[PDB]
């Protein structure tokens, strides 16, 4: 395990590498059930979309308060912030945003920040470059700084990150990444989300980090869970995707952060109808050997737990 680059970034740690988990309450704690109590995340997935309605926003606070204040304290949620106007459809409204429509969800989110008081991550419009969402550059990069700017002005406790959507969204160039790009003074953190095994060996993920560390910003992996592979198949499923997973961790200094998403995944895409019903059962519960290894990785003292 290389030792860490550190860039001095808005709550990114000194030496380690934070560990998170997601994306639902329970599956959560089935993870935390199964990795050991002492082994706890740092760092819980949510999510919200900004163009639902003003009470949804406030609700998901509240549940989200609850959730926090039911779990030991000091755990940093980190917020997948949309603005789509349908699951996976191509369906960005980054531009009415931009616009100031949705300004009163807005406001509506950054007091769900302030009522929680506590580090966080904000990735603004994360994976902005997949066509699932349809985001246009110049009006992405004027909603991201919109928010970074009223979180410094309102001195909220949220590290901003600029997340991509990786292998998913085939790499693109860096030309092209950087259409998207609001600047260095507005991103804390840059982030990848990280799920096909191939993605790993693929050059794109390297350029991706070597940049990352060029810009000066801590990497966190927003997102990742074993797609097409899942964790049934024991030594199978291990070596095929979490092998090159936990390899990808040692072998980049700038990675601080992870978030492995504990999900059975045909499950979740029936129930919230998002088109993610072949991406296997990601479960690390439900198989011994998969679990037994991936509680072995977390022993490892580079990872930031509690």
């Not at 990444?177 to 693929?202: K, Q, T």
Request: charged share 25%.
């Amino acid at each position: 395990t290389k030792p860490r680059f550190n860039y001095n970034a808005k709550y990114e740690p000194q030496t380690g590498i934070y560990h998170g988990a997601g994306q639902d309450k329970n599956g959560f704690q089935d993870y935390v059930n199964a990795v050991g109590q002492d082994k706890m995340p740092a760092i819980y997935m949510t999510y919200v979309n900004i163009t639902a309605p003003v009470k949804r926003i406030e609700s998901w606070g509240k549940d989200l308060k609850h959730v926090l204040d039911s779990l030991p304290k000091g755990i940093m949620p980190q917020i997948g912030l949309a603005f789509t106007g349908g699951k996976d459809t191509g369906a960005g409204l980054d531009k009415e945003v931009a616009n100031g429509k949705y300004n009163a969800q807005l406001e509506a989110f950054y007091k769900v920040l302030l009522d929680l008081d506590r580090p966080s991550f904000t990735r603004i419009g994360y994976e902005f470059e997949g066509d699932w969402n349809g985001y246009s550059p110049e009006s992405f990069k004027k909603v991201f700084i919109t928010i970074s700017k009223a979180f410094e002005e309102k001195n909220i406790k949220s590290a901003t990150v600029w997340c991509s959507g990786g292998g998913s969204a085939n790499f693109i160039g860096l030309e092209k990444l950087m259409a998207y790009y609001p600047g260095n003074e507005y991103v804390d953190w840059w982030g990848i989300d990280v799920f096909s095994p191939e993605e790993f060996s693929n050059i794109g993920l390297k350029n991706f980090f070597d940049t990352a560390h060029t810009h000066k910003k801590p990497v966190m992996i927003g997102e990742s869970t074993p797609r097409y592979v899942g964790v049934l198949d024991g030594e199978i499923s291990w070596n095929k995707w979490f092998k090159p997973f936990f390899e990808m961790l040692n072998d980049n200094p700038g990675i601080k952060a992870f978030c492995y998403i504990n999900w059975d995944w045909e499950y979740w895409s029936n129930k919230n109808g998002f088109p993610w019903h072949d991406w296997k059962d990601a479960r690390i519960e439900k198989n011994p050997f998969v679990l037994e290894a991936y509680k072995t990785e977390m022993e490892n003292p580079i990872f930031i737990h509690l």
